Every structure is written in structure tokens, then in C-alpha cells.
Design a binder for this molecule. Sequence first.
Ligand SMILES: N#Cc1ccccc1O
Ligand SMILES: N#Cc1ccccc1O
Ligand SMILES: [Mn+2]
Ligand SMILES: [Zn+2]
Length: 442
Amino acid sequence: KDKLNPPTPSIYLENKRDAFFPPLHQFCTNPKNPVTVIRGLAGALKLDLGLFSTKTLVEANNEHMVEVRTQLLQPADENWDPTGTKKIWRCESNRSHTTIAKYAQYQASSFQESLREENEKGPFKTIKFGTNIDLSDNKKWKLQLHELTKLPAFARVVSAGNLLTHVGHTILGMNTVQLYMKVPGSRTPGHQENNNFCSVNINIGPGDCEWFVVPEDYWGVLNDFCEKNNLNFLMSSWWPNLEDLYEANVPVYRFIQRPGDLVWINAGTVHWVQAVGWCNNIAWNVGPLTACQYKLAVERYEWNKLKSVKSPVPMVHLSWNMARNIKVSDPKLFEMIKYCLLKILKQYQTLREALVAAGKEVIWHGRTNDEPAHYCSICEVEVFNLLFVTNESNTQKTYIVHCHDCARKTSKSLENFVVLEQYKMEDLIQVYDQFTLALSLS
Ligand SMILES: N#Cc1ccccc1O
Ligand SMILES: N#Cc1ccccc1O
Ligand SMILES: [Mn+2]
Ligand SMILES: [Zn+2]
């Protein structure tokens, strides 16, 4: 069925008017569009993609760290076992580290070597992919990061309407820029984004990338394929067999991203990518203030706890920041936030009361302003308000945080721990009570 190979939602920009046009924002965030390809974006803004050329990067910071993935160079859209016998989901991707200057040398000699071959089942060649390059430092990358402020507000790394701007601290690769340096065949295996946030990706060129996209609501089916093939959905590297997806009636969006094209991956959308030519890419995340985005973020946050995986985004901390600082006028979104806050409040109340009733002292610790969120030093769960710290760490003021469960596993009556309280109970109740539905006529 041609319904299993649908057309990709696309917008063709000509000029700055088209880029700043408000229905473009609304199209991208529509939950019915699992992906949007904004074609011609860089040319429309006169973005200087040369600021991200390999030549410019080498001159800017030649020793900057690059994470290298070594992979097999595979035919078209397929993934074969390394003996060339059968197509499988597991794809090998070994890790090491190099510098921008060393990868640059490989990328250039890779192309020259391919030129010479042009002019003059396996087995498969091996290639190297430069990934997760950290462009967070404003001093090191001044002109690069400035160029990205030319984007329309909804797609920027920082903006008033971006939930990740409201977290209150740096989450590397989410509210900072990541760079990728590629050769043909360089593959990003199947995944969803961290805590299901949207992603923005611009191809620097000169070569193309090819993208595969599956809607969020089919993720359970892909999870099943993984487990059936002895792979973890969240932790392992997998490359879907398209004939398996087709036979299971999963629709796959498939398209080419050319230099200057911006790809918007909507919340929770499952995707994997390969370079067709030689190119660089930049990417980051964004969180639109919609019900769909809040729901899918919370859902992945909770799924991560069950799977013993850490959440990079502290949704409890973020939720209180939303109630404090953002006017919310969508009734469905408002009710979601209100529900989540009321649950948090009740959990906190129940724990605090059990502690007091057990004759355990709750020690006022207060909070420094603009202080970030905290996680459990053992299990890496987010920990909110009530912190559990050993007697010794308390005295030494190294205040190492534990969650309640981990402290109790180690010290059965918490006799080895102090309980620190950051937020006055009446504060939290106030913030909650103050938070009401705003009127918008839009
Ligand atoms: N090699 C290497 C490396 C790994 C993590 C962070 C910085 C590095 O230079
Ligand atoms: N419980 C516990 C514990 C473990 C290492 C050091 C100090 C402690 O209170
Ligand atoms: Mn991605
Ligand atoms: Zn813990």
C-alpha cells in the first residue's frame, strides 16, 4: 500500500517573509505532522553555512574533541550481517575519540580517494563518522552561534517560548548545539530524542543526507521488533529492516535533506539517518508549549524510571518553573500541568509526614536562587525538595544527594542520613494555588 510510503510534509521557502511567516511555526508543531522538511531555509535567510565548513572549523579549534563511530559501509537502505548472508536489525558502531583536525584529514582524503576510484552480500568496507561535537562554548564559537540567532524565534536554541530555555541550566546537546562531520555511509541508528523533545537539524552540505521517519504511535511495534531480535530499544544500536516494517504495516516517511534544508523532528517521532554524500550537520532540541509536547515528555520521563535510564530533562523542576513563570491559556495543557503538580505535592506531603511521625528530623536547608535540579548519586533519578545526605557529607558540607529509596536500602532506619528541606511547604502550595488558566482569544 502506498499509504505505507506517504509523502513528507514539506515547505518551500523563497525569502525572509516566508521564513518569518507565523503559519510556518504552527505547521511544524501540528501533532499530525511527524516531521516537517523546511526546504531552502538557509538561502532564504542568507545564512552563511561557510561558518560551519570543515576548513573554518579546523582554523577555529583544531584540537576540539570529536566522538568517532566506526561502522560498516552498507548498501542503500539495508543492513546486512557482516558475512553478507541475511539482513538483520543489529548494526555495529564502535566508539573512540579524535580531534577536529584529525577527522578533517580523514574526511578530505576519503573524498580524494573516491575521486581516484571513480576515474580509475559483501564484503563491506569500514567507515568513520564524527559525531556529538560540543559547540556550547560562546568564546570558542562566537561567530558560529551568532549566525544561528538569524533563525525565526521558534527554531532558535534559546527563546521565550522554548521549554528548554525554562529549565534553568545547561543540558549539553539539548539547549546547546551539536555538530556532526560525515562521509558517505555515516549512520545515525534508530532512536527517539531525549525525553521526546522536538529536534532541529540543518545540513551544512555540500553532500546530501537521507532520512527515515516513523510516527510516535508506532513505537511500541518497533520496541517489539527490537526485543524479538535480542536488542534494547533505548540502549542498543539498531537499523530497521524496511521489509519487516512493511510486512507489519508500519508507514515509513522517507526523504532527502539537501544543503540549507532544515529538518524539524516533531515530539516522540522515531527516526534514523544516513549521509549519501560528504557533509557536516548541526542540531539541537526545542520544546514547544503544547499539550502534545508536555504529555510525551512526561511519558518518556516515567518510562525511563521503569527502564532504569536517566532523564536529561528534570521534568519536576521544569514543571514548577512553568507554573511560576509562564502564562498558560490552552485548557488541555493547563490541566496536564495542574494534575502533575498536585501529584508531586501529595507525594511530598506523604513522605514528609512519614518522616516526622518516625521521629526523623527535617532540617531546613533553604535554596540558593537560580539553583538547578538534582539527581540521585546512586540511581540517577531526579530528586525534588527533600534531599537525603549522609551524616559525614553533611558535616563536610559536600552535600551529596541521594533519593529516599537508595538511602533506605543502605541505612534501614536512615540513622546514617540527614533529611534536608529546600522548599517551604506553604511556598509550593502558594505557587500551585496561584497558577490559573489564562485567557487567550487566539
Ligand atoms: N579521548 C578523549 C576524551 C573523552 C572525553 C572527554 C574529553 C576527551 O578528550
Ligand atoms: N549508609 C551509609 C554510608 C556509606 C559510606 C559513608 C558514610 C555513610 O553514612
Ligand atoms: Mn535525532
Ligand atoms: Zn536513588
